């Protein structure tokens, strides 16, 4: 199933969205490289596309595709993902669609290549790129993820898996929102727990998504709060030493929340606390979050 939801300004069926043939690119002008990320059914591979944006210029791109082991329903879901990406349009703070190969073979989704890879591994390596990481970087990543999230919300799009492992970093320390989806081995990632029917990122999920399967723009805002916690603790897994079980669900239902990370400015922990409000209607919108971090950046400067 396609994970990203698009709501009517009622859910829009992604198969009903259009595929603009302006994105069509010939497969024989792609030269594949190393695998950047891989799951059981899909992968993201680095590639050199020849004459994609500029007429004759070669450029590094990332290709989303499936492995030969993928069934028909997955190939359809990749086409549906390409239509959502095409519908979303362009924004600085998302991993943008550059082209696609849908004729004469399997679907290949061509997007921007972000040289630093995922933010979670970037933050983890910066514990204990040659350059050091400071508070000015973390505040900028918070600001850019929020702009990217408010862009998605403006397109009536609920991401449903916002976490540091789905945020890429590129030249200039620009954070772009992504979703590895089938390009990650969730069968071997302890952040996705088995619900008996599927593997979910429970520690990033709002109470109403765990208890009622309700994913709203507000639930996404909860996940952003968990992301801020991850980011300001330099890649620490949420709720340390607390396994996802009956005890975890009880405290979450009761109103238990994580403690402020060490590197978090007080105004930033208040942002987390408001994203974690039990009542979704009392949580800030991404548009309100952007204005808050804009104020925090000017106070710093
Ligand atoms: C709702 N909503 C969906 C999206 C969305 C969904 C799907 C997509 C598809 N596109 C991609 C692209 C990339 C990608 C691009 N560049 C890299 C570079 C990478 O690594 C390099 C660094 C290695 N390290 C260097 C030292 C050793 C390791 C890894 C991954 N990517 N990953 C995944 N999907 C796009 C957007 C956005 N919003």
């Amino acid at each position: 199933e396609v994970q990203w939801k698009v709501v009517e300004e009622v859910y829009i069926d992604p198969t009903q969205l259009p595929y603009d043939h302006k994105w069509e690119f010939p497969r024989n002008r792609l030269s594949f490289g190393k695998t950047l990320g891989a799951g059981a059914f899909g992968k993201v591979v680095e590639a050199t596309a020849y004459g994609l944006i500029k007429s004759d210029a070669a450029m590094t791109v990332a290709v989303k595709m499936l492995k030969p082991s993928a069934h028909l329903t997955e190939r359809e879901a990749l086409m549906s993902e390409l239509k959502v990406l095409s519908y979303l349009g362009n924004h600085m703070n998302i991993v943008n669609l550059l082209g696609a190969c849908t004729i004469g073979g399997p679907t290949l989704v061509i997007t921007e290549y972000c040289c630093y890879g995922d933010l979670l591994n970037f933050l983890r390596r910066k514990r204990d790129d040659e350059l050091a990481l400071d508070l000015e970087d973390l505040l900028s990543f918070s600001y850019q993820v929020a702009k990217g999230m408010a862009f998605l919300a403006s397109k009536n799009c609920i991401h449903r898996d916002l976490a540091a492992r789905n945020i890429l970093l590129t030249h200039g320390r620009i954070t772009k929102i992504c979703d590895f989806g089938l390009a990650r081995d969730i069968k071997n990632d302890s952040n996705y727990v088995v619900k008996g029917n599927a593997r979910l990122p429970v520690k990033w999920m709002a109470p109403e998504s765990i208890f009622n399967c309700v994913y709203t723009f507000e639930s996404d805002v909860w996940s952003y709060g968990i992301f801020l916690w991850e980011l300001f603790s330099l890649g620490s897994s949420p709720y340390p030493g607390m396994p996802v079980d009956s005890k975890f669900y009880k405290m979450i239902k009761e109103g238990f929340r994580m403690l402020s990370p060490e590197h978090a400015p007080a105004e930033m922990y208040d942002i987390m606390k408001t994203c974690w409000d039990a009542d979704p209607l009392k949580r800030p919108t991404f548009k309100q979050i952007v204005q808050l971090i804009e104020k925090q950046i000017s106070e710093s400067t």
Side-chain angles (χ1 to χ4, degrees):
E1 200 205 5
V2 162
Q3 306 297 314
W4 328 310
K5 306 296 171 206
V6 169
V7 323
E8 299 236 4
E9 260 269 314
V10 30
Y11 292 87
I12 290 173
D13 184 21
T15 62
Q16 285 181 321
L17 286 170
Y19 175 56
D20 199 344
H21 308 106
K22 78 168 186 188
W23 296 114
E24 204 62 33
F25 182 72
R27 198 176 301 262
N28 73 334
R29 306 192 191 148
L30 285 170
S31 180
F32 297 91
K34 292 170 192 183
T35 294
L36 301 173
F41 299 120
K43 64 177 166 187
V44 180
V45 189
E46 178 182 337
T48 301
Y50 297 82
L52 182 50
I53 308 298
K54 320 223 355 193
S55 152
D56 297 287
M59 72 170 303
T60 306
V61 284
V63 189
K64 222 279 162 72
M65 61 177 87
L66 298 181
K67 312 234 266 197
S69 65
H71 264 51
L72 178 54
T73 86
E74 281 94 48
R75 302 196 286 267
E76 299 301 302
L78 182 59
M79 190 58 234
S80 276
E81 289 182 332
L82 169 55
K83 294 181 186 176
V84 168
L85 288 196
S86 179
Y87 156 82
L88 292 168
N90 193 278
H91 182 91
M92 176 57 62
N93 299 126
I94 81 146
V95 174
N96 291 295
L97 175 67
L98 298 173
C101 319
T102 71
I103 310 162
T107 308
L108 298 190
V109 179
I110 310 146
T111 81
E112 289 170 329
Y113 175 83
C114 312
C115 65
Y116 298 99
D118 71 298
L119 190 55
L120 181 67
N121 275 292
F122 179 84
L123 292 170
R124 284 176 177 186
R125 294 216 194 194
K126 296 307 183 232
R127 278 175 182 235
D128 299 54
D129 186 354
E130 313 173 23
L131 186 64
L133 184 61
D134 58 36
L135 181 84
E136 183 163 338
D137 295 314
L138 306 179
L139 288 178
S140 166
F141 297 163
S142 313
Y143 180 51
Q144 301 181 72
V145 171
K147 293 190 291 118
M149 286 310 291
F151 172 73
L152 286 186
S154 83
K155 289 302 204 128
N156 299 314
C157 178
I158 300 144
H159 188 290
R160 278 174 38 140
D161 197 7
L162 178 62
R165 61 183 173 270
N166 287 322
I167 293 160
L168 305 179
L169 197 82
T170 184
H171 290 287
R173 284 189 181 184
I174 303 304
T175 60
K176 301 182 156 276
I177 294 153
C178 196
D179 192 354
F180 279 83
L182 290 184
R184 103 148 40 79
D185 187 5
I186 57 166
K187 211 156 191 167
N188 291 306
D189 193 312
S190 67
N191 297 300
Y192 294 88
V193 201
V194 181
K195 210 79 169 69
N197 34 153
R199 299 178 179 270
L200 306 177
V202 179
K203 290 187 161 199
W204 287 261
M205 288 161 70
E208 71 270 15
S209 295
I210 290 163
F211 308 137
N212 302 278
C213 310
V214 169
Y215 296 101
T216 53
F217 301 101
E218 281 106 340
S219 73
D220 252 18
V221 169
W222 173 289
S223 294
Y224 177 74
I226 310 297
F227 160 69
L228 286 194
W229 192 93
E230 288 185 84
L231 171 60
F232 280 104
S233 64
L234 299 181
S236 172
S237 279
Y239 304 94
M242 286 189 66
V244 173
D245 66 353
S246 295
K247 194 188 201 79
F248 175 74
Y249 292 128
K250 267 190 193 196
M251 24 226 59
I252 291 301
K253 203 188 184 213
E254 248 191 357
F256 152 75
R257 301 297 183 253
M258 283 186 293
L259 295 169
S260 185
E262 236 181 335
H263 308 102
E267 303 91 5
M268 281 294 159
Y269 187 50
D270 288 5
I271 296 183
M272 299 176 218
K273 285 179 65 181
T274 55
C275 298
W276 301 337
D277 205 308
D279 175 17
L281 299 184
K282 295 176 167 197
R283 302 171 189 158
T285 70
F286 281 121
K287 191 153 187 164
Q288 296 172 337
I289 293 155
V290 173
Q291 298 168 27
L292 292 159
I293 313 169
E294 234 149 10
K295 202 186 176 165
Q296 296 197 50
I297 288 169
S298 64
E299 269 150 359
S300 101
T301 58

